[PDB]
Amino acid sequence: DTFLEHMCRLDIDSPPITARNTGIICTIGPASRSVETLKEMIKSGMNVARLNFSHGTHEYHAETIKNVRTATESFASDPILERPVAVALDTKGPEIRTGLIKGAEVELKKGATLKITLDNAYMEKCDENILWLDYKNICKVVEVGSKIYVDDGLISLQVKQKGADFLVTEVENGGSLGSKKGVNLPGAAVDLPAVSEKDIQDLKFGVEQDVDMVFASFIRKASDVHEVRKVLGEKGKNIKIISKIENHEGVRRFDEILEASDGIMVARGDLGIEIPAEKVFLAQKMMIGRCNRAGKPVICATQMLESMIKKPRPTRAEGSDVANAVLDGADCIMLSGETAKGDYPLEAVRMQHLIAREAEAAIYHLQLFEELRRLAPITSDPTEATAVGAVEASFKCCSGAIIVLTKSGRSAHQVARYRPRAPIIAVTRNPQTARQAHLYRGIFPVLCKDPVQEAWAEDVDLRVNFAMNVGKARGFFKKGDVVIVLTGWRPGSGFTNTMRVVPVP
Amino acid sequence: DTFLEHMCRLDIDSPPITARNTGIICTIGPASRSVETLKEMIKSGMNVARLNFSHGTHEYHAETIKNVRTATESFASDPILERPVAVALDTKGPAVSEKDIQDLKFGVEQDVDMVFASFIRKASDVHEVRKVLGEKGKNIKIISKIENHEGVRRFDEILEASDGIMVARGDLGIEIPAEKVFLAQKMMIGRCNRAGKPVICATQMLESMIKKPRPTRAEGSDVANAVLDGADCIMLSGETAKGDYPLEAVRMQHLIAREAEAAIYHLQLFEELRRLAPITSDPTEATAVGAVEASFKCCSGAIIVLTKSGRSAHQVARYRPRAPIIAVTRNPQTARQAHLYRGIFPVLCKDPVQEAWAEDVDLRVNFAMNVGKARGFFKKGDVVIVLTGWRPGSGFTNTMRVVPVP
Amino acid sequence: DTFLEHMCRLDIDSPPITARNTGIICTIGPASRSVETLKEMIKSGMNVARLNFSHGTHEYHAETIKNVRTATESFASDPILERPVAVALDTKGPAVSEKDIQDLKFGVEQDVDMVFASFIRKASDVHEVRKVLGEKGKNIKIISKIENHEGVRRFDEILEASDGIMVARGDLGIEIPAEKVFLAQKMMIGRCNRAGKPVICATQMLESMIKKPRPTRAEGSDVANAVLDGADCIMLSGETAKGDYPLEAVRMQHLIAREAEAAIYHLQLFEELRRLAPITSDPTEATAVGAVEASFKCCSGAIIVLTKSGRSAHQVARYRPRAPIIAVTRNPQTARQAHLYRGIFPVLCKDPVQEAWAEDVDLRVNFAMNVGKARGFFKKGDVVIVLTGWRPGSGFTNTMRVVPVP
Amino acid sequence: DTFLEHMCRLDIDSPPITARNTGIICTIGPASRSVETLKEMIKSGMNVARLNFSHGTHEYHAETIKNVRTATESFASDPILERPVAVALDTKGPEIRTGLIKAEVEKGATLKITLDNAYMEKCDENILWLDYKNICKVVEVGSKIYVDDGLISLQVKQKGADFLVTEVENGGSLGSKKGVNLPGAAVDLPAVSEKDIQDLKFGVEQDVDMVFASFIRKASDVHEVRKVLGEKGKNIKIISKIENHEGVRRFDEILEASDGIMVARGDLGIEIPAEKVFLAQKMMIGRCNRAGKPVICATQMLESMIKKPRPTRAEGSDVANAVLDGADCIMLSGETAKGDYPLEAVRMQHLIAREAEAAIYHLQLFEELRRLAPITSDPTEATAVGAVEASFKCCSGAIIVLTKSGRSAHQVARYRPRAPIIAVTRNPQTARQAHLYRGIFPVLCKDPVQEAWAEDVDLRVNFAMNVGKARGFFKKGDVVIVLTGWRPGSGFTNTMRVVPVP
């Protein structure tokens, strides 16, 4: 194997063989939340439920959550279809908008001159003379010459003059303007509502409904992740924080943002507003890779299967975008409007699956490990040695999977860092961690209900059995195959794990 | 170090430094048939103008061809900031259409450098193209388009007997689904990368620009991946053929494909190609490998390669140098023709052959050296590789020598 | 990081670290039949005593055998500082003589652990040896002696059906030239090293020592290379059977074979062995692999295998750790037989099986861990590997555990 | 492929198919100086003639050098058997010895050492005399003292001014005028003896190629030999011998002052234990390959052949491992020098060193160098790599380097290509000073310089090409790598050529 030989090897007439190891994330809204539909999506690929909180009442969303779990335990008895499904709360996050034009729309021209006001007296009065935006400190951030984007980039402006609560500007790019539309100020250290006053109410609601992770919107500094961390508080200290990066300053300070966050979202489109089309894919590839390094998870969202909103199949251009995002090393890719409000929210999960599977054939597979095996330094942490021993063993006998008995999920994280080829089956009694686990590439979680036992050995022996049967049923392996097992820690005890190579009964 | 460590280091705040190494092909048409316009399209990065035969009588084309050439030479007053422009005949196709035979003869006798042959499915399907071009077109390079499913099915044999390959993704995503086409593309490119023959990615490039001065970041990303998949050229269509911002289109494509460059892992692309290549015994190839290895060993500003038929510069290119291959030639066909090759920056020598064979060589090498300087690639004091023959008439380019810029 | 950088680093002023990992076999005769002597030979490094069955009859062997065991057990005082001592019957042959079969029967029925069967040629021969030993001694180990050109000619099939190989360079020196014999030795040792089956090389070791208390530096060198070639044991002949300094001869063999260690480059020997070996369906192999691989990842002070059969400890040995393999066993034949393998230090558990498994395992594991400390292999605080089973009477050793020395 | 796979491939029924690439050094005296014998040895593999200066009058040696160059140019009548034999001067160097036994005498007993010159011819098993005047100055109570081929170690119970009283340890038949050793003390200079300077002078005069400086124990020691050879001998290669502990101790500085190294195994074997010597060997050879510098393995090699027609298997293998460790040249002594089989030894020596090539991990060796080696700004380095790569790209029969100095054909060797480097030269010295280098085969150009550089190159290239065919390095219709030289002004840059064999 060389990488290039591997590319020449590819075969579009050969059917996928590997598990899809990328977790699918779906945004639930209007078209998706009916328990029956929700049931179909779980069954047909879904791994996480996104809640878009720039909308809804809490009563709206709490019902949506209730439906999710209804559909989840709808499969309670059957090992063939039982999968954890997780719930993710995506805050609305700090944002700027324009006013209401005559409150309906105006029209903007090229090169023309625009004035902007903070003056709320000019809130519902809005047009080509003056525009108003809810940001009150815009003058202490923006300087002369600064470009300002408006309504999904579609209209840019600059800055000729700036004083106190006004700014005279000059349109660089034109197009029809409208009411209450989004505004970005590229390269600008946007002064802070760290978390919105709304966000704290949705964060608290989040803690209340036992969500798994928060996708914290619009993150710029370390402190920002630290805010959501604190607001979540002792009450919510196992809620995973995934910071969205949606603007230039995020890419800039991305190093400390990853240190603080539990994970990372690449908002491609929102990135596309403040930084040029020719530069974004670098920034994506950079962030993804830096996460793969950090061992933290990375979600790839925006502009995925959006064709599927009105058609039952995606454009080939879109087939590409996802695949070459699987490949740069995203753990998960998130569907947006195609599940939340489309006319094909079902095919969308279906396609997104089909696609993410095909793409596994092009993952440079065996080599991925072989590299970090070597270069990896010498430890003294036994847990490290044990995982290598496991992934090594994994490869010594083409095992069909590596069953890891974990509470936290940590021990099955470690193992995934060494990127084995065979899937990791993370077996857990903590129904949380089972969910907070789709965030991780090539980990397939499995919920153990059978309860704790006195003698460690016979307890371990039990869940290994559980995994073995689930595994047989999914088709991870037959009888008379070998599999690698990490037990957990014994509960005396030295905090040491145990690697086992056991044949499948 | 590592592929991954590369990705981690990427920075969208530090300007690209390497030059674009992927060749921009453009489809010329109503939006761009203007001589006055083409003077801005090659100044902005066009390296091949493509003619779409699907819509034309010869007088339609012949005038356009003439208009291309007319604007090419409008720079000849500076022999170094000057650059070749090939011309491409893209057949209308459906085997070999009998309309086409009437059109191939037009090309053959219009000095077209390459033929993008259409709906190619077999060896017979390209052999049949070949003979039609005849002895008056034994040179002219034919690039098969893979469009049906069978092209991907019988690809090796097509590659076996073609000069180039064009993947037309649109016309692929129609016979085969989306979950599979990107797979098809990656394999093809990769397979041309091995065999040495050049490959170009076409269709759905910067389409959104047909009605807008900037493109979608989804398009920036589709184009750059073709770059990094190992493509030599990306070809524009409606963006410059019938578009509304054709010039603006080209400049973007350049901009993109230059950014893209920051993400190619050379230090391993080379390594793998070198490892796969056979032990063959062209004196002329063995120099290339040596030439590349040495370019890496001293971090050379460029590899200068004096060549007749291009084939020398081709070989150096096969092994993917980090540094630019400046091909120096008089044969201005294999010079225009050069552009279907990654990282080759061909340059036309207009100086009358010199009396002494040493004097001749020294002139051409000092030319490339002066092109390379003003063009940006190196500065006085740097180190460059240089390939020349040992004597003249040697059916070989097999001298290699590391020499400082003056 | 490089074979060469290792070589440059060596130091004749730096006292050695590693324990000798190569087995010392000695030949018992007049100079060493003594019990008073043997008590000083095993104390000084003998791990397998060899009875030379060319010149002798059974009563004289039986007294020597008994002499050995009498001095062996004379250290049973501490169950920790005591070492197994295997017993070797070296047949005389010139296929299988009547005198052999008579002598083999004496061996099979004397608890001998291994038979060095002489002048083996084709596959048929070891087979003819097997039969002789029958079900009575199915356990005894067959070490094929290679002594002429036919051995080296048909070596694969021989190896394919012996338990081990002895290279007799002297007797191999007669049959083929000097300039080729090292070539032959290097290949055999290396072929055994692959196959996993242990190799001993003998003859021309420390002959000079028969008369002198110290050997020639060319003997120092010849032995050390046999070590570095990948031998498991080097065996002394006349040096200790007749020599005026037989005991003095062993300490040197140790001393040399220990210094030799500093020039082994494990950090590759492992990587190569591993790269060559195929995938298993057997859990007990895969664990070894993982264990040795883990032993490098954390620089483990040792690898502790708990084994019945031996096969568990043998596996770990095949992949060649830097770390010493302490095999803990009850079966004291395997404990003895264990000496045939590089870097396995076998220990005998004289403790009676415990009631619970947990109980049983934890005792044997604390055994090695104590023996370990007692020797030099680790100190309190170090990390070690530990390879037990899961349920008892399981077909396998397949538990990998990384534990701190208490 | 992998090292171990390689070890498994080895076939003793398959005949050697590689150039010997270890140059053979023979010691010449009594048994070997007849021109007619020297002829048969040159034909049979000799590459360097050693002269042992512990003996012989200058006119003795003077003649011996002449007979060599007589038999050398005996073949120059053609270019096919003609090899550039080289001449090496081996100083006798500093020595400490003991007087005449009052021809000798002889465990646990107590013995007295005297500086007292009156006792010179008055030696016996109670009193012993030795030159080294400062012997007591570099000793404490309990320092070992070895005597007569290490045969008699001794400690020291007490010392004062002009006497040492001490205990026997190892014993056996003493003799007279037998050497003594002090492991491992900073032994007193002069580095170069009085006799040494006379012989180094005669060396420069008789135009030898290299000197083998005996007993080198520091950098100072090297520089003394160098300044003695002086401006007149500035191109005579110095190969420091390492014969004691201290040499090994300070071996780093000794290696950069020297042009080369000799591992005196047996002399090493008397001051440092038999269990440690082979480490010292591998260590020194090892550091030398890393240094570019040549390494010669001497002593113990074929001494069995002094009285038998063939060597013992232990001896065969010792040499083979000396080759494999990384030695460029392995030197014969008494077996060529004064034996009953001198021709037969150079034969066996060659045979062995060839067989051994099959077990050198050939194609791998290079691959490490390519990666590990850094970035240069030194065009000459890149061209070398370019050449060796090209060498490998088409399995060249050889890599022909046109060199004056030999510098450039050295680089190429630093990168361990697998094809023989045929070094083509006009300077008939840097041409003999060239066997000291592994897998370099020199060839002497007689044909004279031309003003048209292009055609001067074209000429020697042709020369080499023909030599090469005849030696058997390559047929016609093969490819070969060429480095031309530097030009003539000029840009000091070399030129790599892939040329087919006409």
Numbering used by the authors:
A (entry chain D): 24 to 126, 130 to 531
B (entry chain A), C (entry chain C): 24 to 117, 220 to 531
D (entry chain B): 24 to 125, 130 to 133, 136 to 531
Give excerpts from the publication.
Pyruvate kinase isoform M2 (PKM2) converts phosphoenolpyruvate (PEP) to pyruvate and plays an important role in cancer metabolism. In contrast, PKM2 has low basal activity and is activated by an effector molecule fructose 1,6-bisphosphate (FBP). PKM2 exists in a dynamic population of monomer, dimer and tetramer and its pyruvate kinase activity relies on the formation of the tetramer. Upon formation of the tetramer, PKM2 can adopt the inactive T-state or active R-state conformation.
Phosphorylation of residue Y105 inhibits the tetramer formation and pyruvate kinase activity of PKM2. In the crystal structure, PKM2Y105E binds to proline, which was derived from a crystallization condition and might have facilitated a T-state conformation (as did phenylalanine). No significant conformational change around residue Y105E was observed between structures of PKM2Y105E and PKM2Oxalate. The crystal structure could not reveal the mechanism for the inhibition of FBP association. In contrast, the addition of FBP results in significantly less of an increase in the extent of tetramer formation for PKM2Y105E (compared to PKM2WT). Interestingly, PKM2Y105E showed a slight decrease in activity in the presence, but not the absence, of FBP, with a kcat/Km of 1.2 in the absence of FBP and 4.3 in the presence of FBP.
